[PDB]
Every structure is written in C-alpha cells, then in structure tokens.
Design a protein around this ligand. Structure first.
Ligand SMILES: Clc1cccc(N[C@@H](Cc2ccccc2)c2ccc(Cl)nc2)c1
Ligand SMILES: Clc1cccc(N[C@@H](Cc2ccccc2)c2ccc(Cl)nc2)c1
Ligand SMILES: Clc1cccc(N[C@@H](Cc2ccccc2)c2ccc(Cl)nc2)c1
Ligand SMILES: Clc1cccc(N[C@@H](Cc2ccccc2)c2ccc(Cl)nc2)c1
Ligand SMILES: C[C@](N)(Cc1c[nH]c2ccccc12)C(=O)O
Ligand SMILES: C[C@](N)(Cc1c[nH]c2ccccc12)C(=O)O
Ligand SMILES: C[C@](N)(Cc1c[nH]c2ccccc12)C(=O)O
Ligand SMILES: C[C@](N)(Cc1c[nH]c2ccccc12)C(=O)O
Lengths: 317, 314, 318, 314
C-alpha cells in the first residue's frame, strides 16, 4: 500500500485553515497553534484506543486469566510514554511569543479552559471526579471507568481471605504490637528535649498507622470524595504492595505503579496547560489517590506478616 | 470559533483506517503505527511552513533589512525544537514489539525506506544533494532556490570582505602564514619533541589549505563542498567577529543551520534503527562547510583585529 | 593530561558513603539517592558559574558595550538548557519505589524541604525574595551582593527611546492607548442597544481599566512595596520598549535576553514543583521576573504602538 | 545527618580545577567541559552499581528463585532510564561552540576517544567483545562473568526446550518446514508473472532465512567469527520466551530480554553522540545481537507450536 493513502494524508494534511487568512490578513504563527493542538488530538486518540482496550480486558473478564497481565501492563506503559511526549510538546508553543499570539488572538478568541472532547472522554474513562458529541460524553460517564474496573479486580486479590492468611488481621495485630513495643522504648528514654520530641513523633505516626484500620473513617472520606477505592480494594492494593516480589503479584505491582505514573503525568499536562494559558493571556484530580496514599504508609519491613509455605505456593505461577 | 471546528477534527480524527480491520481481522497495535506517522506528517507540514517562510525572506530580498534577522533566527530555532520532538517521538514506536508488528505487517507491506513526500520536500528545500502532482511538487522543490543557495548568496555579501576595505582574507592569510612561520622557528628547537614537528607539519597543511581556491573549486565540483569560495570567507567573517553587534544574530543563524543539519541526521539515524528493529547518517549534511569552517583551529591572537572604522560599521 | 586526573575523579568517585552500610545493613537503593543529589549539585555549580559571570558583566559595566550581548544571552540560554536536564533528572528517582525508599530512610531522616546551599545561593543571586555555619558567609554574600534582577533593572532603566526629550515612548503610548480606547468607545456606542452591545460595553470597560492601569505610577509603587511587583517603574518602560521594538537591531538580542529570563524563571518553578511532588511521593507564582511576564501579556493592538521616526530608527541600528 | 555532609560535597564541589586558570589565563567555558564529564562519571558509577548487583543475582544463583525477577527487571529498567538521561546530556555541550572550545583546547589536549575507566568497565561487564590499581579493576572486568554470559547460562535452562518434554525446537522445525512446503505449492499455482516471480523470490529468501535457524553448524561458525554471541541452546531459550511471552512465568523474563535490547541500543546512541561531539569540536557490535536477530525472525503466528496443557500449567 502507498504511504500517503495508508495514512489518509488527504484528510490529515488538508485540515489546516488559518482564521487570520480567511478573515483578511494571515498571521504566520497561527499555523503553529493549529498543528500543536491537532497533534495533541492524534495522541489523545491513541491514548483512548489503548485505554478502552485495557478497560475491555477488565469488563469482558479476560483479566481473570493472568496470562493477559502482560498486555494490560504494556498498554498502560505505552499510555505513560505517550503522556511524556505530550508534556514535552509544550516546548513547541513556548517557541511562540505572547506578543505574536496577540496578533492572531481575536480571530479565534480562545477560552482559558479544556475544550477538547477527547481529553474529557479520557478524563472520564480513567475516573476523574452538542448532539453526537454529547452522546459520546454521556457514554464516557455512564460506562465503567478504569478506576471501577481496577477496584473490582483489587477486591479479588488472593491472601485477603480471613480463613486463609488473613492479611488485614495479621497487619493490625503486628502494627499495634510494634507500636506498643515502640512506646515502651520511648518511655524508657532519659527525660530530655529529644525524648519529648519522640513522644510527638510516636503519637503522630501511631494515629496515622492505626487510621488505616478505621473503616468508618474510610467510608466517610469516600462519601466526601477525598477517597475513590473501596475498603476491600485498599486491602488488595496493600497486599500487592507488600508482596510485590511474589511472582503472581510482580506484574500487578507494575500495573499499580503505572496507574500512579499516568495519574501524575495527567497532572503535569494540566499544570503545563494552565501555565501556557497564563503565558499567552495572563492571569484533587488524582483518580488513584488511594494508590499514592497506600504507597506512603511507612510500615517497617519486619512488621509485615510473613509468607507461610502453603501461602507461598498460592501466589506462585 | 469552537476548538474542534477550528482544528478541523472532522478530517484529522476520521483518517484512521486499520488495514487489518478492513481486510478481515483487526490488530490493535496497527493503530499506533498509523497515529505516529500521521503525527510526524503534521510536524513535517509545520517545518515546511517555517522553512518556506525563511526561504521567502531571503528570495524576496527582505534579508537585506537586518530588522528581519530576529524573525529568521527564531523560526529556524523553532524548526530545531520541532525536530528534537520528532527524535523523541521514536520512543513511542519503541513501545511496540517487532513480534507484534509482524502480526499486522502483511496488511501494509512496509518498505525499508523514506516514503514521505513532505520529508523529501523538506530535504530538497534545505539543500540535500509516488505519483501525479506529487511528482510535480517534488520537481518544484528541486527547481526552486534551496536554503543552502539563499544563505550562500547572502554570505557572499558579508561586510568586511571588501578587497581593500578591511580585506579579511588577505590579512588572515598574512597572519596565518606569519604565525606558522614563527611557529616553525619555535618548533625547530632540540632533537626530534618529534611529535611536535609532525603535529606542526599536519596542522600547517590543514590551515594553509583554507587559502587554496583551486582545491575548493575542485571539491565543490566533486560534491564534497557545497558553499562558494566567497561564501566560505563570509561565514568565517561571521564566526571570527561574532561578538560584533551586526554579526551576533547572523552567528545564531549559522549555528542553528548546523543544529538543524545534525538533527536531520539524528532523525534519519533513528529511522534506520527503527526499520532494523522491526524488519530483518554519513557526512551528507547540507551545511558541511559551516561545520568544516567552525573546526579550523586558528589561534585567537592570529585573527585580524577590527579596524576603528570597521568597528563602527559592524 | 589524563582524563581521570583532569576531572579529579579521586574526589568525585570517592564521595559515595551509604549510611545504611556505615550503620549496619546496606540498602542497595540508597546509592541512587546519593548519586542523583550529587549530580544536581554538579549542575547547580555550573548554573552558579554561568549566573555569576553574567552578573559580573552587568556589575563591571561591560553590558554597556553591546558587543557583549551575545555572551550574556548564550550563557543564560545555557542555564535554561541545564535546567531542562535537571527537570528531566526527576525521572531517575521515579525508578525508586516509596516502599524501597522506606527501607533506607531511617538512616538519613530526610527533611521535606530545600536543603541545598547551592540552590539557596542560586535563588538569592537570581533575586528570589523568600541551619549553617562558615557556609553562612557565602549565604550572607549572596543576600548582600547585587542580584540579577537588580542588575537587569538598572540596565533596563537606560533603554534608549524612553527620554521625554527624544521619542518619549511613555507619552506617545499613553496618548495612543487613550485615543484608541476613545475610538473603541465610539464604536461600542454606535452599535445598537442589543445584548451583544452591552456585553461588549462591559468587556470594554474592564479592558480599558487594565490598559490604563499601566500608567498609574502610584499603583505600581504600592504593588512594589507589597511584593506583588519587583522591577522599578522606569525599568517597566524600558522592558516594554524592548518588547514593542524587538525587530530593531539594537533590541533584537536584549529581547532574546528578556525571553530567556522568563524561561529560567518558569524552569526554576518546574524544578521546585517536581521537588515537592517527589517529597510527597516518598513521604506523603513568586517568580523573580513577574513583571516581564506581566508586560508580555498587556494586550495592546499592533496599530496603537507608536511608530519609529527616521531619526529614531537610525539611533537603534548598529 | 546534614545534606552536604551526607553527599560529601566537600570532595564533589572541590574537584573542579580549570587547566587554563592553573596554566595562566582562565577560560570560562572550560568549567562546563569539566562538570559535564564529572556528571557522566557519577552516572557511570550508578550504572555499574546496578549492573553488578544484577550480575550478582545471576552468579550467586538467586535468579533461580523467580521471586527475584522483579528486582532484576526494575534495576535493568533503571539502567536504561539513566542511559536516556546521559544521551540527553549531550545537549549541554551543544551550548558550547567549537570556536570557544578552541580557546581552552590547548591546555588539556583532549584525545578523540573513550578515556573513561568506568565506561570501559561498564562495556566489559555487559559483554562488549574485545594506573596500577585501575589496571587490576580493568583485568577483573575482563576475567569475571559478563552479563551476556550470566544471561546465556540462565537462557540455557529455559523450561520447554527439553526434547523429552515439550520439544519446542522439534515442533518448530516441523511446523516451519510443513508451512514452507504448503506455501511453495500455493506460489506455484498462478501463471508465470511479475507478481508470481516477486512471490517466488520472497518465498525463497524467507525460506533460506527461516531454515537457517535450525543450522547448528552455521551458528557454531558465526559464534567463532564473533558475528554471534549466545550459544545455540541460549537462542532456543530466548525464542521460547519470545513466542510464549504471555505465559505468566515468561512475562517478566520477556521484559528482561526487551530491556537488554534497550540498554544495548542506548549504549550505541551514547557512543554515536560521543563520536559526533568529538567531530563537532575537533573536526577529525551490540552485545545482545542475537536477541535483536531472534526478535526479527518473521514466523507466522499460526506456525508457532501450541502450548501443551501439561507444559502450560508448568
Ligand atoms: Cl486549538 C484551540 C482553539 C480554541 C481554544 C484553544 N485553547 C487552548 C488553551 C490556550 C488558550 C490560549 C493560549 C494558549 C492555549 C486549549 C488547549 C487544549 C485544550 Cl484541551 N483546550 C484548550 C485552543
Ligand atoms: Cl505509515 C507507513 C506506511 C508504509 C511504510 C512505512 N514505513 C516506515 C518505516 C518503517 C518500516 C517498518 C517498520 C517500522 C518503520 C516509514 C517511516 C517514515 C518514513 Cl518518512 N517513511 C517510511 C510507514
Ligand atoms: Cl541527598 C539528601 C539528603 C537529605 C535530604 C534530602 N532531601 C531531598 C528531598 C527528598 C526527601 C525525601 C525523599 C525524596 C526527596 C532534597 C532534594 C533537593 C534539595 Cl535542594 N533538598 C532536599 C536529600
Ligand atoms: Cl574531561 C576530558 C578530558 C580529556 C579528554 C576528554 N575527551 C572527551 C571527548 C571529547 C574530546 C574533544 C571534545 C569533546 C569531547 C571524552 C568524553 C567521554 C569519554 Cl568516555 N572519553 C573522552 C574529556
Ligand atoms: C483470578 C484472578 N486473576 C485473581 C486476582 C484478582 N486480583 C488480583 C490481583 C493480583 C493477582 C491476582 C488477582 C481474578 O480474580 O481476576
Ligand atoms: C545589508 C545586508 N544584510 C548585509 C549583509 C550581507 N550578509 C551579511 C551577514 C551578516 C551581516 C550583514 C550581512 C545585505 O546586504 O543583505
Ligand atoms: C549603552 C547601553 N548599552 C544602552 C542600553 C541600556 N539598556 C539597553 C537595552 C537595549 C539596548 C541598549 C541598551 C547602556 O546604557 O548600557
Ligand atoms: C528455575 C529457573 N528460574 C528456570 C528458568 C531458567 N531460565 C528461564 C527463563 C524463563 C523462565 C524460567 C527460567 C532457573 O533454572 O533459573
């Protein structure tokens, strides 16, 4: 097949219409403003294509066969590699001065906000808090998000069962026993400024570590919007974090890592967008907050419940 | 106007047809192969748009008005910023395995070579030495004045080259020959230290070769050199007196022409690596003379000093 | 000279001491934490080296000889190229998990804040408003000596074309803006009494209030005192002169300088942003050149800019 | 512990001595030349730290416990992330002109070649074919087991290769020969045409390449000439991981083989950039070839032997 025909370059390379030229005098830098945003749209289509395919593996039940974990992780990694290029793409509009932008702003009247349908679809399908387009926007909100599909899959994490292993029970016992042992060590210290400072550190860290086990606090924060994943999904994600080296949890740990990567890359893009808007015109959204929050619970290695010989065979291929 | 209408997203976002899907079974990774090359094409259109505008400033005589030097240099810098992003873009196809590419390769049968019309137009318009009106557009790119030719013409008019008004080439030949003569007496010291006499003979052969107009006319004919002898003198004048206000922005232009040249090479290098990655870069740089002139190791003290009248002029 | 001796690799490659290894059990990922921060320090030394050299060109009066504008602009561009690499460098600590960082954190107890002496010196020398010893002498010198913002402010106050006797840029600008706004008010009043006219009447009143605020020296002196602005009123006039007449040969390279000062400023912000994200990842716009950003976004139509007289055009030509 | 003391900044920040300043007149741009190469050295020490730790997991037998595959893959991925930054680092020396480099070149006299001990150690420890205390470190890098050798040993133990068990090589040879026989008959059907001739040539070229995989004598010959580095048994093992990458036990080893090719091509991009830098200022063999070669054997999906239910569970 011919390169140009295969890539439909008759549509792609004939979609650049300068409003300054159509409404009188052409402004050279306006072509850059068209091309950058068209190139963002081509990459948003690729990100959407990969996102929906990963969503489909979860929805249609193929995620149950752990043979499909490679395809899930490699497509999410591809999404982060694309996002890194889109953040780098801002360097191109930075080659345009605001003084030059002012010469063609008037012909477009650009609003200082996210006006991309694909970016809104992307935000909705991940799990962010007219006419034919409105149907696509409604479907993005009604259908299962990546956050929901991941939450469902996390609730089935092996090792959580109270009969077998009882990860949450052993964790609560080891943390409370470790904090009790730490309190005694602090009390036995010589009464000094450092000893009083260590009581504050201990009391603060104890309040934080034990708050993990407060299901009522989590249910309250979930209602306020400050948390997104279920209490059972939090236990499942922590199981993957703590036992990441276990073969059945190695690739799911890479998945949880890339979901946090995509989340912070989405934030860097929005940050850059806001900077660009202020550069030209002048003067919470983390879907996987729980994954970032769970990754910063500072539990000492020795307090993590150990893997039994029978349990070690359970999380092995 | 509305974002999607302004960007004509009805054409842009409805140009993705997977040949695996049209000819039977869809292969997911084929969409990435379409999008990357369409995104390269959007940027090749922008690079062409900037390149032709800079070519126009030289062709229509606006380069004579030094007020336009900022616009020329900023658009060439923009071309290098876009090229750096296109070199970075190879990281996206690197997320596709060759094993996965093999699953959709039969539906397109990709040739191991540059098949872009815009890339060939870009190469031609800079100065690098398939059917219908595309062959006519390719012939216009070969017939019209290249950036190398337009820059060569402008370089021949560089101030300070006047045979008696400064006479840059005459003073340079005299100071270099006198400096090499003074170095030959200082080189001839004790026993052969032997490495210093050999290094002098090699460096003398290279430095003095600059003044051989017959050797340059020969290399120009063989294709090993692209700029005229007068243009070489003009570019060296800008290099040596880069600090002079009139030569500050033209020095930025000569540097960015070498930057775009080496970025064009990095892109072609990456393309060849990608082709070998999926299936079973030399000194052909348009501005070879600019790289060659920038590496002539003439000591700072040997450069002719700026005349009091010439210092006000430049 | 030998590569390793020239680069003093006997010091550089023997400066990596893992506190986990020193205090008992070694933790592999701790070496990464040392190397990345030592590499940031090497580049902070280079940025300081370039910054001080550019500061010296302004202090010793060499900036007056416009022959030195290339050296000033190329070193500031080099500073932004280095800053872009430092922002990219965050990708290396992102290869370390917070869970793995936790295994060596106890041995160092890293504070969640900027603890680099060189980064503080860099911030001070540029002109950032806002525990040591001996190093407190270097910190005091950074605070007492002229900042880049001050040196640039002084140089901006000397911009050609500002003089009321010759050209009078500020006078012509105020006249053309007020006359242009008066002509725009007539076009708004000459329009019907429709919703579009009233919507345009409010947009005109707001845009007129913004444009004319540029000429309020008392408002600027107040904002300067509150910290919301950093450059003098005369320096603002000088920077706008360079912005509007950037094409003029004598103003081409100074325009590149003003552009790179805004680039370094936003790159310094991206670095601090990334630092804060890294700290939250592991543990859980006060820009120096605000005025340059603010002046670049005053939406004045091209036709309202005062024209260059034939005698004045020859003045700004080298 | 204090930031500056912990990082030993007393050594790090007092290792910059400009030879221009020591030998008379200081040249400002010389400081950049020192800092960039010192920063490359800090990263070569980190790469070596990660590389040796991964070598140790293979040497001490910990690679046998597949629980350690995550730590092996994440440290190799970290090595490629560091290498990408070192390739990006060339942008810093590109802010220095050759004319400015010439003003300090005389004081150091830099040779146009790899003069780093750490880069040589890195090259040797990966497996690149080839002072007093430093010469001992260089000899240990050549005598000790390379990453290529340690990976080759581990690849020879890949499950599924055993002729008694799954017999991957036997089923592959049978399916390829039968598939090529079926393709030959399909080609020899339409009347002798240009398209038929194009199909006969493509078939004969692809048949010669596919069947060459089963020539152990050709591989033993190429291994002796240096054109190939991995043993014949290791090639079978790597192809087993490529073809059955989706199998849970082979998912992480596939990521490892992918990153070994990434590090390899990044090492090439670094050396390429080094050579370009040397030509910019003066003017003047991939360790895992077999992994790249195996990834480009164009075998149709349906010809790959199907996973036996006994082998799939293992
Ligand atoms: Cl192509 C186009 C058409 C109409 C508005 C925009 N606005 C930009 C923001 C922006 C505004 C002024 C100066 C620089 C940038 C924009 C970019 C991306 C998105 Cl998702 N929405 C919006 C762009
Ligand atoms: Cl979109 C399309 C359609 C048909 C052929 C190509 N060939 C690629 C090269 C390439 C070949 C195989 C695997 C990876 C890459 C190509 C890329 C860029 C250019 Cl200018 N020409 C050519 C691509
Ligand atoms: Cl090498 C070293 C020694 C002691 C403290 C820090 N703190 C880091 C911040 C940071 C803290 C925890 C996890 C990740 C990062 C830091 C980095 C840069 C600067 Cl200027 N100050 C501080 C680092
Ligand atoms: Cl720090 C130092 C001291 C002495 C020689 C080199 N040579 C550089 C190459 C190079 C040569 C001239 C101009 C630009 C670059 C070099 C860089 C990296 C390595 Cl591994 N070996 C060597 C550098
Ligand atoms: C059979 C299973 N894939 C089990 C499962 C669920 N979540 C997981 C997380 C990590 C590892 C395994 C799981 C499934 O139920 O989908
Ligand atoms: C007025 C002029 N631009 C002079 C000129 C020619 N080449 C140059 C290079 C550097 C500086 C100036 C020139 C012209 O004749 O076009
Ligand atoms: C002679 C002069 N260099 C003039 C000057 C000052 N600031 C400027 C900005 C742009 C152009 C020129 C200047 C001086 O007074 O420093
Ligand atoms: C037990 C084992 N790790 C088996 C092994 C060897 N090479 C492999 C490649 C992929 C998967 C497994 C292997 C060993 O013998 O090292």
């Amino acid at each position: 097949l011919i390169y140009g025909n295969y890539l439909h370059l008759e549509k792609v390379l004939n979609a650049q219409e300068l409003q300054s030229e159509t409404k009188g005098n052409k402004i050279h830098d306006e072509h850059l403003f068209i091309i950058t945003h068209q190139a963002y749209e081509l990459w948003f289509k690729q990100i959407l294509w990969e996102l929906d395919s990963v969503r489909e593996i979860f929805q249609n039940g193929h995620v149950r066969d752990e043979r499909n974990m490679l395809k899930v992780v490699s497509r999410m990694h591809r999404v982060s590699v694309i996002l890194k290029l889109l953040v780098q793409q801002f360097s191109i509009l930075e080659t345009m001065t605001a003084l030059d932008f002012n010469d063609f702003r008037e012909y477009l009247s650009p609003a200082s906000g996210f006006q991309s349908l694909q970016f809104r679809l992307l935000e909705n399908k991940i799990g962010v808090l007219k006419g034919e387009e409105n149907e696509l926007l409604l479907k993005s909100e009604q259908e299962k998000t990546l956050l929901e599909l991941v939450e469902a899959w996390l609730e089935r994490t092996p090792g959580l069962e109270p009969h077998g292993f009882n990860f949450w029970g052993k964790l609560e016992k080891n943390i409370t026993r470790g904090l009790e042992e730490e309190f005694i060590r602090i009390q036995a210290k010589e009464e000094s400024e450092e000893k009083e400072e260590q009581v504050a550190e201990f009391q603060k860290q104890k309040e934080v570590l034990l708050s993990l086990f407060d299901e009522k606090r989590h249910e309250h924060l979930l209602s306020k919007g400050e948390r997104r994943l279920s209490y059972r999904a939090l236990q499942g994600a922590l199981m993957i974090y703590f036992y990441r080296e276990e073969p059945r949890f190695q690739v799911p740990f890479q998945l949880l890592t890339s979901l946090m990567d995509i989340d912070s890359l989405m934030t860097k893009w929005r940050y850059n967008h806001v900077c660009m808007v202020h550069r030209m015109l002048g003067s919470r959204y983390k879907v996987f907050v729980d994954l970032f929050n769970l990754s910063t619970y500072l539990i000492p290695r020795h307090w993590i419940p150990k893997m039994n010989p029978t349990i070690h065979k359970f999380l092995e291929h």
